[PDB]
């Protein structure tokens, strides 16, 4: 993976109010010395989880969730990694949640190739009208505003040239499912 840039994408942990920690099998995968950047959708919700992210990578980016204690976090962020402009927002601002029309407006407003958002606690990674939309879900399986059957998940973006290969990690039963999703810039 020389020349690849590995970006961990996760959020909605809701530690400690809703969950105590990440699943054991996720923690065995998330080890220091591999990830280059972390893009976090927020709702950590405390400094202890931010410190944990810093153990995984030096470059940690977080946006403000509606339950985060740290009010210094920006509401939204745009970053460039390789050839991709990437937008990041927690997503409680999007009503109804996950609304495709509202996310596409945010894509155009941020002017990004990839838009990352959270809040639904439901993993999604898909291309729509030649732009890419990622929701990493909740890496702890925290309950959301509506329901409790939440699949723990996170995403890893492997960026090279104008291609991103998005690896999705889901805890289904007690086993980790891994799938690979490709998106190419035009």
């Amino acid at each position: 993976m020389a020349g690849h840039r590995l970006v961990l994408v996760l959020g909605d942990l809701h530690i400690p109010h809703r969950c105590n920690s990440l699943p054991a099998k996720f923690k065995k995968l998330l080890v220091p010395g591999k990830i280059q950047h972390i893009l976090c959708t927020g709702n950590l919700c405390t400094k202890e989880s931010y410190d944990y992210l810093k153990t995984l990578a030096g470059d940690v980016h977080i946006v403000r969730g509606d339950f985060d204690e740290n009010l210094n976090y920006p509401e939204q962020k745009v970053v460039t990694v390789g050839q991709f402009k990437i937008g990041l927002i927690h997503g409680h601002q999007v009503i109804p949640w996950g609304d495709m029309a509202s996310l596409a407006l945010l894509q155009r407003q941020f002017d990004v190739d990839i838009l990352i958002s959270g809040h639904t606690h439901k993993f999604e990674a898909f291309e729509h009208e030649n732009k890419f939309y990622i929701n990493p879900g909740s890496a702890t399986g925290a309950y959301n505003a509506l329901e409790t059957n939440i699949i723990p998940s996170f995403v890893l973006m492997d960026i090279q040239a104008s291609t991103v290969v998005t690896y999705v990690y889901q805890l289904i039963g007690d086993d980790v499912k891994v799938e690979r999703i490709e998106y190419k810039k035009s």
Binding site: M1, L30, V31, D158, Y167, V176, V178
Partner: peptide, 7 residues
């Protein structure tokens, strides 16, 4: 391969 970049 099986766990991608985290394997």
């Amino acid at each position: 391969d099986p766990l991608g970049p985290l394997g």
